[PDB]
């Protein structure tokens, strides 16, 4: 089976500059078997280049392709604000036809620190038999961040869930919410609930906590 590896895994470039994407094939096939597709946020993928050098109909001249043997590249000369999406290389060489893992083009910006906020469960959720406390990290760049949960200053692992949102349409920052779910035997068996956050925009990790009893 032919395996296509894209590079880089993630890519961030502010509008105006040059975008380069690479796709390397495990086996060797004709250069006319490889195409490039672009898929935007929550959209069906659309054809971008076929034959590794033949631009699709209607695609602007900003997209070009160059292929040789087991090395293919997609070049974007002028990249506009509407040109940030995920890019897949796929082959028609051997069955089954396989796509690449993709490459997310990102809108670059200056580094910002995430506001870290904490929200406890409601009385209804103290009534449901399962209580979740949500820890939010907002307005940060880049996407990379780490959060660790502490029940009475004791590290938690395997008992929390994560959800990071997509890039905003106006500020290009990221947001993230992580929930910690427990029962009453755990929620009323301790006092302290804390998030410690490690971000590239923060020189030192920040530990922020709350106590159910005091409030």
């Amino acid at each position: 089976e032919i395996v296509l590896t894209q590079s880089p895994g993630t890519l961030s470039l502010s509008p105006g500059e040059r975008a380069t994407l690479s796709c390397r094939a495990s086996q060797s096939f004709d250069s006319r078997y490889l195409g490039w597709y672009q898929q935007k946020s929550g959209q069906a993928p659309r054809l971008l280049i076929y034959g590794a050098s033949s631009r699709a109909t209607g695609i602007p001249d900003r997209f070009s392709g160059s292929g040789s043997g087991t090395d293919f590249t997609l070049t974007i000369s002028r990249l506009e604000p509407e040109d940030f999406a995920v890019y897949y290389c796929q082959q028609f060489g051997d069955s089954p036809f396989t796509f690449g893992q993709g490459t997310k083009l990102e809108i670059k910006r200056t580094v910002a620190a995430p506001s870290v906020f904490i929200f406890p469960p409601s009385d209804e959720q103290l009534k449901s038999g399962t209580a979740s406390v949500v820890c939010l990290l907002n307005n940060f760049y880049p996407r990379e961040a780490k959060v660790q949960w502490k029940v009475d200053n004791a590290l938690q692992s395997g008992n929390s869930q994560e959800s990071v949102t997509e890039q905003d349409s106006k500020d290009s920052t990221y947001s993230l919410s992580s929930t910690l779910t427990l029962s009453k035997a755990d929620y009323e068996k301790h006092k302290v609930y804390a998030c410690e956050v490690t971000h590239q925009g923060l020189s030192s990790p920040v530990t922020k906590s709350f106590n159910r009893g005091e409030c």
Binding site: G35, L47, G51, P96, Q101, S122, V134, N138, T165, T179
Partner: protein, 231 residues
């Protein structure tokens, strides 16, 4: 310009079989070199080609999934039916039907081929749990005076099935900073998300906060009040 639309059961029970019908317009399954392909994208993963049927009723399937995948065509009704049996919970994905075509030029030189227009896509899930209305728990701004007028407040919609739930803050009069994070599959094959809004602490007790949460498969229309809770 050509279009393709998928339809079928978006709620498929485990170890059962689904049938998906793609109706296409702008072309017919009679032109040489024209085919209909079925591709799937798992949530958060890369694409995976499933099947491809040609104009001369020649069909190709992925060898790792050809034992349980059947593809049929109806040129009269311009339809393509994909039947897939023996479902597993990891088969949940979004399924596209796409137009497949090649480009020869006056000498049969084959300047490549492509998957041109893809269908809108049907999000099909494989699970046992049935529908369930979401439980809404309001998430309270913390006890802070000003903090530079920076705060966030939300509501958590948890234990609902299936996707999706639509959240609106103050009926469109509060959309500045409304983050509706993508819902996460709970450990029990169930869904839970948080919807929050970034607001200034200088307008805590004077600006109303509501979240109208909606879920058609469970017909859940709950207008949950969010209010500041002190100590």
């Amino acid at each position: 310009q050509i279009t393709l639309k998928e339809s079928g059961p978006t709620l498929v029970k485990p170890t059962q079989t689904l049938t998906l019908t793609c109706t296409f317009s702008g072309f017919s399954l009679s032109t040489s070199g024209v085919g209909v392909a079925w591709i799937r994208q798992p949530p958060g993963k890369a694409l995976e080609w499933l099947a491809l049927i040609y104009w001369d009723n020649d069909k190709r399937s992925s060898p790792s999934l050809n034992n349980r995948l059947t593809i049929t065509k109806d040129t009269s009704k311009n339809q393509v039916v994909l039947t897939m049996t023996n479902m597993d919970p990891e088969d949940t994905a979004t399924y596209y039907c796409a137009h497949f075509f090649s480009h020869y030029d006056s000498s049969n030189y084959y300047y490549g081929s492509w998957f041109d227009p893809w269908g809108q896509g049907t999000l099909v899930t494989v699970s046992s749990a049935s529908t369930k209305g979401p439980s809404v728990f309001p998430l309270a701004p913390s006890s802070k005076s000003t903090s530079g007028g920076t705060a966030a407040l939300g509501c958590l919609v948890k234990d609902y099935f299936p996707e999706p739930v639509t959240v609106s803050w103050n009926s469109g009069a509060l959309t500045s900073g409304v983050h509706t994070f993508p819902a996460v599959l709970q450990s029990s094959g169930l869904y839970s998300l948080s919807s929050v809004v970034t607001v200034p602490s200088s307008s805590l007790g004077t600006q109303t906060y509501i979240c109208n949460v909606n879920h058609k498969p469970s017909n859940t229309k709950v207008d949950k009040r969010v209010e500041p809770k002190s100590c």
